[PDB]
Design an enzyme around this catalytic site. Structure first.
Site, mmCIF file in Angstrom:
data_model
loop_
_atom_site.group_PDB
_atom_site.id
_atom_site.type_symbol
_atom_site.label_atom_id
_atom_site.label_comp_id
_atom_site.label_asym_id
_atom_site.label_seq_id
_atom_site.Cartn_x
_atom_site.Cartn_y
_atom_site.Cartn_z
ATOM 1 N N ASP A 1 0.864 -1.182 0.000
ATOM 2 C CA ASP A 1 0.000 0.000 0.000
ATOM 3 C C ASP A 1 0.903 1.236 0.000
ATOM 4 O OD1 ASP A 1 -3.143 0.626 0.516
ATOM 5 O OD2 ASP A 1 -1.913 1.986 1.702
ATOM 6 N N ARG A 2 0.710 2.208 0.898
ATOM 7 C CA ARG A 2 1.583 3.387 0.899
ATOM 8 C C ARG A 2 3.054 3.000 0.991
ATOM 9 N NH1 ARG A 2 -1.986 6.326 -1.298
ATOM 10 N NH2 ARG A 2 -0.827 8.252 -0.812
ATOM 11 N N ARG B 1 4.478 2.267 -2.199
ATOM 12 C CA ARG B 1 4.749 3.499 -2.941
ATOM 13 C C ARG B 1 6.061 4.136 -2.495
ATOM 14 N NH1 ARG B 1 0.485 3.921 -5.883
ATOM 15 N NH2 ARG B 1 -1.284 2.649 -5.124
ATOM 16 N N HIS C 1 -11.406 7.456 -2.077
ATOM 17 C CA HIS C 1 -10.675 8.049 -0.965
ATOM 18 C C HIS C 1 -9.410 8.743 -1.440
ATOM 19 C CE1 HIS C 1 -8.956 4.051 -1.519
ATOM 20 N NE2 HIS C 1 -7.925 4.370 -0.756
ATOM 21 N N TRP C 2 -8.933 8.405 -2.639
ATOM 22 C CA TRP C 2 -7.769 9.089 -3.190
ATOM 23 C C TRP C 2 -8.060 10.557 -3.434
ATOM 24 C CZ3 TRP C 2 -3.078 7.230 -6.001
ATOM 25 C CH2 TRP C 2 -2.584 6.073 -5.384
ATOM 26 N N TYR D 1 -2.042 11.278 1.541
ATOM 27 C CA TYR D 1 -2.908 11.281 0.355
ATOM 28 C C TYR D 1 -2.832 12.593 -0.427
ATOM 29 C CZ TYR D 1 -4.827 6.698 0.906
ATOM 30 O OH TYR D 1 -4.992 5.340 0.953
ATOM 31 N N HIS E 1 -7.157 -6.796 -0.734
ATOM 32 C CA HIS E 1 -6.012 -5.889 -0.707
ATOM 33 C C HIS E 1 -4.971 -6.271 0.349
ATOM 34 C CE1 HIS E 1 -3.812 -2.166 -1.133
ATOM 35 N NE2 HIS E 1 -4.103 -1.775 0.094
#
Lengths: 297, 297
Positions: free
Chosen positions: A108-109, A112, A153-154, A217, A278
């Site tokens: 997830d984050r 990234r 939510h992005w 975000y 996820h």
């Protein structure tokens, strides 16, 4: 109180120039950094880290601003919560432990952070694993009607402060539990260890932690996208051997075929789906841990 | 408490097979129906209706489910809050007053009811005016990173219940005031009459009213989009003379050049920018009223 989900693991508070990184550390062997995402903390790895600790020195870190890591003050460009900044901070943290060349898996984050780390500083990574993501650029470039509804939510969490913070604060428990449940294969909380849920819920109950997540975000809608855009328009590919894992019912497989996308971003990429939503290391712990051990060794 | 912002107007409760429609009614002459949008009520017309009432019978109606109009029970497809159903309900309401052929101006959600009315039952309209919208299909078709951030609430409010309902409950006063201010040119509440803001705030304080607004946006993401798609594919054009007004700093102008878009949807359309944010009849009441009087005369 909050449970210890990594029996035998040590705990470390690693100083960096941007604040302390909290991590659990266990095992022995080559170093392997594990990074969580939203809305979780390092404990999402608690089902796969013991198996990884049989073969690796496993460092399970809270992201800058998440969990028990310090929260650098943000600014108008959300700089400390850009993945470029987070990658630099974690490189510093690992340097403090003597790890200047390490393996890295993120979800997830944290995934990234991981691929940005590999674009900016590829010499730091032996191998890279990313779980259930496509690059931030790819999500935004694919933001049509269907995808905008799916990952609303992005765009919601990226609204200027204090709009999402004010909405999230009326009932924080509802929102963290909704996000955890909605992205699993079953659609409820059954895949999670209830002690792990309590970690996530307690982290989410702090308004400063929630602000950090919004800044993450916001960075994702702006600077992270711009950073990615530079690379993809320049044909910059990740040169580190990498594994892309995704859930058959997860987020990345929505709006794209993951391996074909990652082959545009990485010169040496292998991929596999896992029957899971996820949250791969909690929904499919055995399958995830086996994929990671095989790839990293 | 709630001020009367329409001096001289009567107040009518118009019965329909779906529930009552509340309307302020004034003036005399040809009938002109005025429809508000989100997050407002009929009182948004309070600075322009008296100048229109110099030449028309002006009916300032609360949309089904909004303001003081009754709230029909929704269903799985959000049917009563689709613009097609809302248009049928308002046609019924106008028939109760003896008006089977009338002029129509709509803003925001009310403008979507209006152009869907014009597509479904063009025989009911002499002339149509839409304020600061493009068709719902066009918004979703132009969904990209930039538009997803600007109109995030299109995807947020369309999430399955009770997610947006719960979050809006976190701070409803902040949210309605944040929506009003953020879509103005000024960026604050200074363009609004404070007594009108009290009307919008009080309506937004009711959780059942907030649920209806989410049903409206859910319709906007699903059935309303599909109804519009049928018309584009069949090449169905609005045959009613239409005026399209938009704010120079409003919503429609960011997605695309609004007159160019509306010409794809209408055979006879004029258009003009108003020096204004989204809330044309309140930010620019003289320019708005002048453009409407000229067009409807």
């Amino acid at each position: 109180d909050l449970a210890d989900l990594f029996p035998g693991f040590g705990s470390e508070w690693i100083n960096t120039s941007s604040g302390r990184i909290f991590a659990r550390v266990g095992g022995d062997g080559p170093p392997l950094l594990l990074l969580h995402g939203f809305p979780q903390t390092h404990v999402m790895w608690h089902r796969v880290a013991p198996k990884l600790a049989e073969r690796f020195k496993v460092i399970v870190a809270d992201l800058p601003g998440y969990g028990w890591s310090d929260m650098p003050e943000s600014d108008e460009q959300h700089t400390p919560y850009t993945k470029r900044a987070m990658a630099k901070q974690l490189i510093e943290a690992m340097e403090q432990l003597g790890h200047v060349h390490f393996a890295l898996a993120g979800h997830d984050r944290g995934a990234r952070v991981s691929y940005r780390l590999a674009l900016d500083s590829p010499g730091r990574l032996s191998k890279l694993a990313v779980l259930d993501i496509l690059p931030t650029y790819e999500y935004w470039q694919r933001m049509n009607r269907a995808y905008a509804l799916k990952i609303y939510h992005w765009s919601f969490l990226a609204q200027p402060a204090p709009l999402p913070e004010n909405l999230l604060g009326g009932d924080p428990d509802f929102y963290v539990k909704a996000k955890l449940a909605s992205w699993t294969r079953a659609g409820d909380l059954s895949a999670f260890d209830p002690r792990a849920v309590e970690h996530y819920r307690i982290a989410f109950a702090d308004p400063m932690r929630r602000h950090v997540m919004c800044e993450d975000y916001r960075a994702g809608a702006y600077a992270d996208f711009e950073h990615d855009k530079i690379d993809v328009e320049a044909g910059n590919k990740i040169p580190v051997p990498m594994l892309a894992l995704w859930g058959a019912s997860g987020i990345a497989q929505s709006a794209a075929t993951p391996l074909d996308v990652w082959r545009k971003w990485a010169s040496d990429v292998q991929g596999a789906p896992i029957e899971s939503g996820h949250f791969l290391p909690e929904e499919a712990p055995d399958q995830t841990a086996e994929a990671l051990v095989r790839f990293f060794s």
